[PDB]
Design a binder for this molecule. Structure first.
Ligand SMILES: CC(=O)N[C@@H]1[C@@H](O[C@@H]2O[C@H](CO)[C@H](O)[C@H](O)[C@H]2O)[C@@H](O)[C@@H](CO)O[C@H]1O
Ligand SMILES: CC(=O)N[C@@H]1[C@@H](O[C@@H]2O[C@H](CO)[C@H](O)[C@H](O)[C@H]2O)[C@@H](O)[C@@H](CO)O[C@H]1O
Lengths: 359, 365
């Protein structure tokens, strides 16, 4: 009964009216037995919408571990025939979850499950390796995709696939990720060797050697928008390898490795290491994210308005109230959303992108 | 007499050749020559080869507006004007009143050959680093604003600027700006606060610090540091011309030093201003992140593979600002900026020469 168009306009009425039977992996394993029906019923798009999009193939590395129904909506939201989608399922997900992903992945020849799966531990190298596994497959399996966008189960796009290609063009062969001067408060992350003690990455207290790099370490996000040339480079380059193994025992390497690579002289699509080229999460186009401690009055020093949903680890899990402002940002994808916190943020967004993409 | 292609590819031997080409010595037009040449428009246009026919349907549907500020060197003005001329666009030229009558006449001369090119209805006597430099652009904005309502963005240029993107490339980046303004705007550095803390007066033709402390800015939002160059939407221009508060802000800045390097940067961070950015520093644009103007400063140049924003200047340095030599061209063309600064015919015509044909050759596709 909810009127989406109104939520998309900030209308306080709907926002308030907004602010149960749920599918399960088994329900998916069953819906996918017949691909043609799943696709038709779930209204997936299997026919390029424009030649412009067919001429600009994108690759995606989606790291997941549960919430099968979110993965379904996410994929459909960003699905196109010319693209390439490598799904990474955590080696620890529910066997039925895994089988459910395979069922969805096996209905499209451009969708598949990474040939190597890692058991992902929070803030550890494995998180990066998850994405690396996906890069290895996508890089070798095709040489025509322009950029690689890595996602996660709780991301959702706020742009159609057309708008994404156009912005990727505006990038003119350059990458686009958050990459800034190392905050002193995040240095402890890589100045000490870490290890998994009790399923938790802990500080061993051993001081690490300096990074085998002439370039300084930069700070960023785990999400990115890099060119195929970048991927091949971190995959092949003899030095990127020295750095990567050095980062293996650091805390949250995913939030400093990509951003540091982006500023290494020889890297395709990179930026000079002069802080004149630094990119903050708001300047970059990778992902729009609201951190608890920055929300406030945008008319007084705040990057963005306060969160209408809830917060998990200081990260705003969007609610129907956030949509209006969010949609006016330049980012490709927003994080995070949760069917268990507000399925309406996702529904309204979902339909909007589909309609806007069909007009 | 020299292979441009090589120069754009950064060939050391070739760059070295222009050096020998210069010292080892020509046609030099003057304001009068132009007053004569403009007598017959058909000929001037045809001869100087001005693209008087819209190139694509994509450009015709996306009108651009330019505000060019000049005071001398009429041959430079004509070259820059041809490099960016397009029938669908609009060009407002501001000639300094301290300029030679022959020069102003030359510009009035050229301007008459084009219905879309005109001299600003109000000319200022510009003083370096003074509020009058901001007033000149403001004078153009009003003329361009009232003259037409279909141009999307206004780009302000000075005499020594040259484009490094074709008009279509420019139109495309503007479409990508998706309605936002693009210009430098960063946290106000400490060493530049003195520019607006004290009052400034022109003494013997040079703006000097009176010592008289001034009232705080008429703003709830902070003061931002930037440059005199920008890219803004027809709405940004409209708002600054009609908005009350801004008036109080501008007049308050009339007695400041280089009001042009904090004024625009600041208005771009004001809530309600069309195409602005949150005051939060997460949205700060450095000169390299913005796309308005590529410019190298002597104290920043050096080993790019070691922290330097860009490599050493190949031309010369006027006031710490690099005047481009053929040698700078290669690296510069790979930057995302719309225009560069600065170029000097007397320092290296080859840099302007190659850059000139390359852009034309590329527009023609
Ligand atoms: C204060 C602090 O260290 N917070 C950490 C988070 O930092 C944010 O990182 C994002 C990157 O997209 C962005 O730079 C933001 O401005 C930062 O505040 C973040 O690193 C988090 C782990 O995901 O850990 C917090 O401790
Ligand atoms: C060191 C210093 O104060 N230099 C002044 C110039 O500063 C530069 O300003 C540009 C603006 O585009 C850019 O931000 C660069 O990083 C700065 O170094 C500049 O303000 C100039 C006046 O035009 O005066 C110099 O003294």
């Amino acid at each position: 009964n909810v009127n989406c168009t109104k939520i998309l306009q900030g209308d306080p009425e709907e926002i308030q009216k907004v602010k149960r039977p749920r599918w399960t992996p088994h329900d998916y394993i069953n819906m996918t037995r017949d691909c043609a029906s799943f696709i038709r019923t779930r209204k997936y798009i299997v026919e390029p919408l424009t030649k412009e999009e067919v001429g600009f193939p994108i690759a995606y590395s989606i790291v997941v571990h549960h919430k099968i129904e979110m993965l379904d909506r996410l994929l459909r939201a960003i699905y196109m025939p010319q693209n390439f989608y490598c799904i990474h399922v955590d080696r620890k997900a529910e066997e039925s979850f895994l089988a459910a992903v395979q069922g969805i992945a096996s209905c499209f020849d451009n969708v598949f499950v990474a040939s190597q799966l890692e058991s992902v531990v929070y803030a550890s190298w494995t998180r990066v390796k998850a994405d690396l596994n996906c890069m290895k497959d996508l890089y070798r399996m095709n040489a025509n995709w322009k950029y690689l966008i890595n996602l996660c189960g709780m991301d959702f796009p706020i742009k159609t696939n057309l708008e994404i290609v156009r912005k990727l063009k505006c990038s003119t062969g350059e990458n686009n990720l958050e990459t800034e001067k190392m905050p002193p408060n995040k240095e402890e992350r890589w100045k000490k060797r870490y290890a998994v003690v009790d399923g938790k990455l802990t500080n061993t207290g051993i001081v690490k050697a300096p990074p085998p790099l002439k370039t300084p370490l930069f700070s960023g996000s785990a999400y990115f928008v890099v060119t195929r040339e970048y991927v091949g480079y971190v995959l092949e380059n003899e030095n990127i390898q020295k750095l990567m193994e050095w980062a293996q025992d650091t805390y949250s390497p995913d939030e400093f490795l990509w951003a540091t690579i982006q500023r290494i002289p020889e890297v395709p699509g990179s930026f000079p290491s002069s802080n004149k080229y630094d990119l903050s999460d708001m300047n970059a186009i990778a992902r729009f994210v609201k951190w608890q401690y920055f929300e406030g009055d945008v008319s007084n020093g705040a990057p963005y308005p306060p969160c209408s949903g809830v917060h998990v680890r200081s990260v705003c899990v969007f609610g129907a109230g956030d949509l209006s402002w969010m949609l006016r940002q330049h980012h490709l994808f927003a994080n995070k959303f949760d069917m268990d916190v507000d399925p309406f943020a996702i529904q309204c967004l979902d339909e909007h992108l589909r309609r806007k993409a069909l007009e």
